[PDB]
Amino acid sequence: AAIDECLKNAKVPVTARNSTEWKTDASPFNDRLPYTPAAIAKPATVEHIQAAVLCAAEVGVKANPKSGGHSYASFGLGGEDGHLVVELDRMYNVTLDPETHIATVQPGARLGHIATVLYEEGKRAFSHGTCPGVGVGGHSLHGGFGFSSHSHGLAVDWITSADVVLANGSLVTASETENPDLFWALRGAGSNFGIVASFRFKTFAAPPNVTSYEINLPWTNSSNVVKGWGALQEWLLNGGMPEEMNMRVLGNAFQTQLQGLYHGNASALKTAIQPLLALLDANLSSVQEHDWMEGFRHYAYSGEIDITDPGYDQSETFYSKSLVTSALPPDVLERVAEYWIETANKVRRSWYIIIDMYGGPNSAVTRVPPGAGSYAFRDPERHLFLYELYDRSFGPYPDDGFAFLDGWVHAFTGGLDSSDWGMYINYADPGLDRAEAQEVYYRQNLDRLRRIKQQLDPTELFYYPQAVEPAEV
């Protein structure tokens, strides 16, 4: 087709439809949501990215970058058939400057590869998610929360500059001192404004020891969930969680526990966690001290860490939702608990819920000021918890299945004003319509996002079904 001929004349490397690599390059992370691209460009340099983008514009097709391919809605594939996919995973180099400790990171580098290189070359790190296969591109441009985030913030907070290919093929560098509107827009909503062709990340010195630990929670009936969560949120909101502690609740039908990573040794952790243990009447278990990389591996849930192979093919079949909330009133705690116990525990599919200890007085995430970036959830009281709800099938996903997580999310949102909750596009939920998605993902920052969108991509070349809409002028 025309897109194929344009890419060829422009000397852009591609994955041919009839090749062996098509299957790998086109395949989603979420097997529930395959899409068939118009074509797959396979850039080795920013020049190829520019030329691919220009081809999409000249020919009249939409284009989307795919970095790690982990979008829960397959938005890296375009979220529908027939987009040019700019597959970035042949571009994964990570360079660490010994002087400034700034990392130059190509946009197809996956988190495990990044973590490995930064640690091996200078014992450095930045704050990012668990999950070695996740691409830096989607992850860092929309937030990025992991077991260093209470201590050090979101992945997006470590970006110091980015080189961007715009919808008309122009190159720009965005930073605090250059294209500041674009830099603001990238840092929360970056899928909408161009293809980032190179990132520069600041780093921190990796702690020599981290300590993983667990606290089992007796959340086997509704009253125990309510009292336990009510205590936990009061503890967090009143500054109980020290900077060095990073923690979440992981629940499934068969066990509920706090899981943590403490940036320090085991004796220091025991001292730091004692107040919470006394409040919950609970005990520590599985206390394990690690070096920095073993700490990462511990929560990776993956055999491979330093992943760079273009053959990468990890995939699951699922539906997922997210939330960001304040502390929850007990009426909401009761509804959420009843749903958990009476409904979720009886669902005959693998599911889990993660409640990250996200905000409160000591969180680095919510110390970032309200105007710093488009990422919407920075209030240390109002943005207290971040949630992942995940519903996974081993066969085909049942078409009536969506009601399960939908009902659970309703148990929260029915009792919270829209100023006290949002959603998180790193757990992209294609059940939301486009208007709803923009509002819940970006909240108070949507209007300015829409204005920048009209300025930078008025034709919506980077369209996907939950993309920011350009403002009308």
Ligand SMILES: *Cc1cc2c(nc3c(=O)[nH]c(=O)nc-3n2C[C@H](O)[C@H](O)[C@H](O)COP(=O)(O)OP(=O)(O)OC[C@H]2O[C@@H](n3cnc4c(N)ncnc43)[C@H](O)[C@@H]2O)c(*)c1C
């Ligand atoms: C599969 C998976 C996802 C995880 C895991 N663990 C996480 C964690 O511990 N914390 C988190 O905050 N998130 C976790 N996630 C979710 C991922 O963070 C999100 O799913 C990321 O958005 C995935 O990023 P990536 O792998 O790059 O996904 P893509 O599908 O390629 O892209 C998503 C989105 O971003 C746009 N995009 C990619 N690359 C670019 C560039 N270079 N420029 C602009 N826009 C870009 C895509 O077009 C698409 O819209 C653990 C697991 C197992």
Ligand SMILES: *[C@@H]1O[C@H](CO)[C@@H](O[C@@H]2O[C@H](CO)[C@@H](O)[C@H](O)[C@H]2NC(C)=O)[C@H](O)[C@H]1NC(C)=O
């Ligand atoms: C990423 O880094 C490596 C260097 O480690 C680059 O490797 C060079 O690749 C070119 C061909 O592209 C060869 O001529 C050189 O011999 C390679 N050098 C080494 C040391 O192997 C690679 O090109 C870079 N990749 C990207 C996508 O930029």
Ligand SMILES: *[C@@H]1O[C@H](CO)[C@@H](O[C@@H]2O[C@H](CO)[C@@H](O)[C@H](O)[C@H]2NC(C)=O)[C@H](O)[C@H]1NC(C)=O
């Ligand atoms: C490519 O798009 C960019 C961004 O929209 C254009 O740059 C803008 O041009 C307008 C009009 O001249 C200026 O007022 C803006 O300040 C520019 N923005 C930036 C970020 O520099 C650019 O003109 C476009 N190029 C072409 C050929 O269409």
Ligand SMILES: O[C@@H]1[C@@H](O)[C@H](O[C@@H]2CO[C@@H](O)[C@H](O)[C@H]2O)OC[C@H]1O
């Ligand atoms: O087997 C499950 C893991 O696959 C799951 O992995 C989670 C993926 O989403 C990320 O945001 C989480 O950090 C990560 O733990 O963890 C739970 C486990 O049951």
Ligand SMILES: O[C@@H]1[C@@H](O)[C@H](O[C@@H]2CO[C@@H](O)[C@H](O)[C@H]2O)OC[C@H]1O
């Ligand atoms: O910051 C808050 C602390 O003040 C609180 O500490 C407890 C206060 O009550 C006393 O009985 C206990 O000795 C002490 O641990 O813990 C919660 C935290 O958010």
Ligand SMILES: O[C@@H]1[C@@H](O)[C@H](O[C@@H]2CO[C@@H](O)[C@H](O)[C@H]2O)OC[C@H]1O
């Ligand atoms: O394409 C999928 C949609 O069909 C799905 O829509 C949901 C179906 O079940 C209804 O009860 C829900 O209200 C509705 O949102 O959402 C997921 C998407 O991938």
Ligand SMILES: O[C@@H]1[C@@H](O)[C@H](O[C@@H]2CO[C@@H](O)[C@H](O)[C@H]2O)OC[C@H]1O
């Ligand atoms: O005005 C914009 C429309 O042009 C855009 O239409 C999309 C174009 O790509 C097609 O594959 C989609 O199906 C179609 O919806 O929709 C968004 C709107 O802002």
Ligand SMILES: *[C@@H]1O[C@H](CO)[C@@H](O)[C@H](O)[C@H]1NC(C)=O
């Ligand atoms: C603490 O860190 C060092 C390297 O920083 C590591 O080799 C050692 O095994 C760690 N200690 C424990 C108890 O795991």
Ligand SMILES: *[C@@H]1O[C@H](CO)[C@@H](O)[C@H](O)[C@H]1NC(C)=O
């Ligand atoms: C919930 O379970 C606990 C045991 O952990 C029990 O003491 C309590 O009475 C139970 N409450 C109800 C209402 O079933």
Ligand SMILES: *[C@@H]1O[C@H](CO)[C@@H](O)[C@H](O)[C@H]1NC(C)=O
């Ligand atoms: C644990 O950490 C503290 C500082 O937080 C340090 O003084 C102490 O020596 C450490 N313990 C061990 C066994 O290294």
